From Swiss-Prot, chain A:
Residues represented out of the complete protein: 146 to 193 of 577
Role: Acts as an adapter protein linking the dynein motor complex to various cargos and converts dynein from a non-processive to a highly processive motor in the presence of dynactin. Facilitates the interaction between dynein and dynactin and activates dynein processivity (the ability to move along a microtubule for a long distance without falling off the track). Predominantly recruits 2 dyneins, which increases both the force and speed of the microtubule motor. Component of secretory vesicle machinery in developing neurons that acts as a regulator of neurite outgrowth.
Protein name: BICD family-like cargo adapter 1
Self-association and partners: Part of a tripartite complex with dynein and dynactin, acts an adapter linking the dynein motor complex and dynactin. Interacts with KIF1C. Interacts with RAB6A and RAB6B; interaction is specific to Rab6.
Family label: Belongs to the BICDR family.
Annotated localization: Cytoplasm, Cytoskeleton; Cytoplasm, Cytoskeleton, Microtubule organizing center, Centrosome
Curated annotation (Swiss-Prot), chain B:
Described purpose of this protein according to its UniProt entry: Cytoplasmic dynein 1 acts as a motor for the intracellular retrograde motility of vesicles and organelles along microtubules. Dynein has ATPase activity; the force-producing power stroke is thought to occur on release of ADP. Plays a role in mitotic spindle assembly and metaphase plate congression.
Disease: Charcot-Marie-Tooth disease, axonal, type 2O: An axonal form of Charcot-Marie-Tooth disease, a disorder of the peripheral nervous system, characterized by progressive weakness and atrophy, initially of the peroneal muscles and later of the distal muscles of the arms. Charcot-Marie-Tooth disease is classified in two main groups on the basis of electrophysiologic properties and histopathology: primary peripheral demyelinating neuropathies (designated CMT1 when they are dominantly inherited) and primary peripheral axonal neuropathies (CMT2).
Annotated source species: Homo sapiens (Human)
Domain notes: Dynein heavy chains probably consist of an N-terminal stem (which binds cargo and interacts with other dynein components), and the head or motor domain. The motor contains six tandemly-linked AAA domains in the head, which form a ring. A stalk-like structure (formed by two of the coiled coil domains) protrudes between AAA 4 and AAA 5 and terminates in a microtubule-binding site. A seventh domain may also contribute to this ring; it is not clear whether the N-terminus or the C-terminus forms this extra domain.
Family: Belongs to the dynein heavy chain family.
Subunit field text: Homodimer. The cytoplasmic dynein 1 complex consists of two catalytic heavy chains (HCs) and a number of non-catalytic subunits presented by intermediate chains (ICs), light intermediate chains (LICs) and light chains (LCs); the composition seems to vary in respect to the IC, LIC and LC composition. The heavy chain homodimer serves as a scaffold for the probable homodimeric assembly of the respective non-catalytic subunits. The ICs and LICs bind directly to the HC dimer and dynein LCs assemble on the IC dimer. Interacts with DYNC1LI1; DYNC1LI1 and DYNC1LI2 bind mutually exclusive to DYNC1H1.
Name listed for the protein in its UniProt record: Cytoplasmic dynein 1 heavy chain 1
Organism superkingdom: Eukaryota
Gene, per the UniProt record: DYNC1H1
Compartments in which it is found: Cytoplasm, Cytoskeleton
């Protein structure tokens, strides 16, 4: 029973940190996308 | 009395769950276990209510049925 409880808590912390990793990856990709948009805008301003 | 055996089984599984906790993953087999046992307890209880009312009607008929052996014996055949 103690092994079973430990296994369940490991699955739980596993999934929680996995969701955290997905959120971090999505936020960094959002930063990359926004900053690329700003680079496009600045190049357009350069040509203007 | 007839459902006495079946009802205790639910109390046993209830007694089992009273020790379990959400931290164990034994909750989910237990959830499966309790539903099956409670499901059986509902069905068999429903069966007896149908049967027991029939027996209640049949024994009631003995009060008002005709006083001949065949009329009685036919009623005692249904209850048997």
């Amino acid at each position: 029973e103690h092994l079973e409880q430990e296994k369940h808590e490991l699955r739980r912390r596993f999934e929680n940190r996995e969701g955290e990793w997905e959120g971090r990856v999505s936020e960094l990709e959002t930063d990359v996308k926004q900053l690329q948009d700003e680079l496009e805008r600045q190049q357009l301003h350069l040509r203007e | 009395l007839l459902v006495a055996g079946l009802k205790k089984e639910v109390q046993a599984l209830i007694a089992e769950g009273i020790a379990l906790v959400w931290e164990s993953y034994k909750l989910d087999p237990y959830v499966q276990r309790l539903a099956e046992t409670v499901f059986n307890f509902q069905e068999k209880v429903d069966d007896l209510l149908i049967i027991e009312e029939k027996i209640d009607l049949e024994v009631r008929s003995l009060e008002t049925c005709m006083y001949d052996h065949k009329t009685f014996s036919e009623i005692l055949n249904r209850v048997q």
